[model samples]
Target: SVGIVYGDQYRQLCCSSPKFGDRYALVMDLINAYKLIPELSRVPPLQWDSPSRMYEAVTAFHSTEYVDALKKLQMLHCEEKELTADDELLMDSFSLNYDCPGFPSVFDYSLAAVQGSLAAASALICRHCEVVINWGGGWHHAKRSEASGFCYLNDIVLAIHRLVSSTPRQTRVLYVDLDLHHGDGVEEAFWYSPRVVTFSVHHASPGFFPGTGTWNMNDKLPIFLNGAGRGRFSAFNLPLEEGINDLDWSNAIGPILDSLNIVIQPSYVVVQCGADCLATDPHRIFRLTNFYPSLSGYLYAIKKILSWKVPTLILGGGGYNFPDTARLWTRVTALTIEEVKGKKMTLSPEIPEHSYFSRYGPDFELDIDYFPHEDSIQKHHRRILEQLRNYADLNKLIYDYDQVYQLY
Candidate 1:
């Protein structure tokens, strides 16, 4: 069966007490929680263990140059190469060490992420599984020869590349990300290429990690996070304000679809549906209930692919709040499998299982019913939506280039 790849060991790295503080582990805990609800696993099935094959498949999509860079980085880490003066300065300022231990080569954790992505792609191509999900590999900020945003390699790019290589020359791939942070790394990998049209929706922060994806004056590469860094037309960014609701999100999608239609008709779609924007979670400030996102996202991706008459590949992305991420993504996973089977989308029993009820005990079942309806915690949700509309309308900022400049 074609479904999102779930690896148990992958969770080990995320939950470890390392400086990163088990972010992925906590996130995976949510995913595993989804597993306990049998209805959810019936489709995706949490089909574990493709690590070896995954490693091989990603190589097919990776650029030899970029792959070599990761390889070198691994080697240097093992050899304990002398850190350059620049590296020393960065280490001091960034609070990172060039000589950090546990650095691996081909089997590195970062590389394995790409391997997981390729495994999903392989399932789609060879196994005839129309959709395969990969939560282990949304390291979107990784670049061609550099690593950023805790991403040493980009699984999205590698998967798409493999798809193109194995398929027809005219086939097209659409990449969409809704992570509340720009998919800077993936965008950089395919910035100039027309085959893969990348769309990102994230908070409009100039100071955040990698800081790319705000559309600019020049239509070409307008969303350069840090001003193109000596390159011309290198990235695109769609900055969203905090606490936005579902209705407002549609407006942004309208133009992106329009642009994609005009640019190229893709044969397949690769989506990173990150849940960083879920408002209820205490961790971040994104506004919106998790329910609508995955369902809405699946409908949108399928509609586009059908219109273009091509296969679509949808992937999992960033999602933080433990309960919300688990519930929402499990809902998303179930719906995707259903759609691929040519059935209607519906929220099954899994939703109630992951509901906040479990967290508070049986006495709070009523609270679980009201779980998604909880009040918007971030006061900025409504204000930000209004501000975005006004800024675009008053300043004529709806165009990609215009939005890019307005933010900068």
Candidate 2:
């Protein structure tokens, strides 16, 4: 069974602005109308009413001072406190600016986001389900003491922490971030812990927002691997060039998984399916087109996770366009449940009449047929393939194993 960790509690966690990222409610509505999801009452409630639980959970990774700053900012926002220069500076310090502004119900929404992710973790580890979806969380850019890249609580870290602590002491969690931005916060949170392996596939370019996670950053790989390299091969980063197509993405991750199987052999998996990676989203900033077919990237990523057959928690991250974002998430939810049942997912080319997403006409199809050119795709794959092959050697070295078999 699939446990959907969502409810009206989460629906309240939304932004006041038009471009707010909380599209979970819209996604749920569309999926329900398509008969793709179960009845609302049938799904378990992902509600946590205790204020203390939220405070304690967030403090697991964030400092008391930072948490207090967040709380104070919410209070100031709620009470319409005129910001003194100091208050304004504090807000900017915590990245409470435009991308992640202080909004209505800021405190409550952040708490709910944290609770929802924790609930997803509980459902997986508690054996209530093999797969759980928390479209509300995956704020991977939120740091221990500051918020950045539109993330405030770092729910991915919080949830993975719950799993690592609750499971056997040796249990390992695999974190796969498919968002366009580097999962710097989540990566940093587990940097010293061998119990979690963090892998990120992001758009890496100079001046990219947050601007970290390049292949060259691996030059200091030893420091990131906990000095002296005790956690060697534990952190994997695939920083892709812009305008990547579906095939190249699949090529990049497939070999990484092959190496992961050889090295980490994690007991649990957390897949962060960030929607900003979609070509249709505006985060590409300079690019006029999406990096890959919107649905294809998510499908390929989720399908790869299912192949691992590990208890998994899937999450949502950056998606700006409401309509495309909602459709992509709903499709992913359906795909997850169906994959668990040993069934292949097939979306009809025709969207249901009167569906809110009907306006996209041909874009409503499950997959898109777009490629820059076969030659460019191959060139891109060739570059990443070399990277993965080198990493594979490192993987075998760190794990002290030899690869006797070959992949054609």
Candidate 3:
């Protein structure tokens, strides 16, 4: 079964983030309005207004002081008054400044987005759904005590925790982040957990926001993976340089699956689909494509994930370009339906009449236009994949488990 988490409360509070503000709601609304993914018609999304359901999961990863501050910040933002001396300090303490402001009802915004993710996790566990799409979730940059890169709450972390705790002890959850940025928050939260593998592919360079995911098998892993530190072997990162296009993804997919082979086989999978990776995005680095003639990497990756036959959660992350994000996510939704329900999600290349139809400008088409960059292909992805694939064989992949206990 395919499940989708969409509702009024989720949209109302989502525009709270000033960075992409109403644009977040725009993607959510666009996905719902498309009507192509007919599975959404069967299941009713929870009518949640308050952040009560995901509070336990939120506090599970965030500290009480930080969580409490979030509440106070919410009150202050709701009042619409100037920050007092202490109030300014409170907001600043959490990194809620120009980067991520303490906007009105932000607590509700973060909490609301998280609710959709948590519900997605719950549905997968309960067998109500096999694949769940929570396009409003995936705040992967938020930290335990501070906000960063427009993420005020770490919803990906909370949802993973919920999955690991409720399921069996040996249940392995594979978290793969396909965003342009490193999934630092979730990786930090589960850095030493054997049951969860945090694998991320992103562009890492000096001066990039929150740049830390520069690790791999050859140089970075032999010491870290086969060494001490508890679940040390579980974290895998493929840090590529700038100017990667859709073609680069074909070479990289082997190693991504190799991580699944080398590490514990996943009982559940969580993917972060940050639309900022698109070649046309204005927000950040890279010219990665969401749609390409050769192969759409995003769709191909999701296809591979579905082939694993595990419960999967596809989430929305950082996307500054609204129309591209809308176009990107709708296809993800489109693909999931054909795989799950055995019904193809067909749509005209022309943008449908919906809430933000005019935004689909001069072309009014789904396939985005691009002027190709001759040097767009990335060179490092092959070496990284070779090194990652070179790291594991059947013996090492399965044998590393018992060996993992000795170091810790």
RMSD of 1: 8.7
Clashes of each: 14, 2, 0
Deviation in angstroms for 268 in model 2? 0.9
Model 1 stretches astray by more than 4 angstroms = 7-107, 215-236, 258-263, 292-309, 343-408
In terms of lDDT, the best-performing candidate is 3
| Reference-based TM-score, model 2 | 0.84
- For model 3 the local lDDT of residue 226 reads 19
Residues 203-290, model 3: lDDT tens digits: 8878786767763235554322311255655667777777766666645654455446445567889999888878889854666565
Quickly count the clashes in candidate 1: 14
Q: Candidate 1, residues 1-408: lDDT per residue as tens digits?
A: 435555555555334423244444444454445452332221221223575554355455444555554555456666869657764554334222332322534225666566566767766666555666666667787655545555556778888887766666475576778787788767766665545556676776656644556534555654334223222222334676665655456445555554554344456677787766666555455555544433343345435444543455566566655555555565555555555555544543443443233642434221112232212212333333333344334423344534432331
Q: Which ten residues in a row have the lowest lDDT in candidate 3?
A: 219-228
Per-model TM against the reference: 0.65, 0.84, 0.86
Tell me how candidate 1 scores on lDDT: 0.53
Which residue pairs come into collision in candidate 2?
Answer: 279-290, 279-291
Which digits, one per residue and each the tens of the lDDT, describe model 2 over residues 1-408? Answer: 777765554665644323464466666666676666652212343554686765677799888887888888888878867789999998888877888887656666676768878878888887878888877778899988888876878889988998888745378888999888888888888776656878888887778877776534445553323211445445667777787766667766766666565566678899898777666676753122222233265677787788788888888888876666766776787678777865544546545554466544555653322344434434534444454444445544355333512321
* Model 3 stretches with alpha carbons more than 4 Å out: 41-55, 215-228, 261-263, 371-408
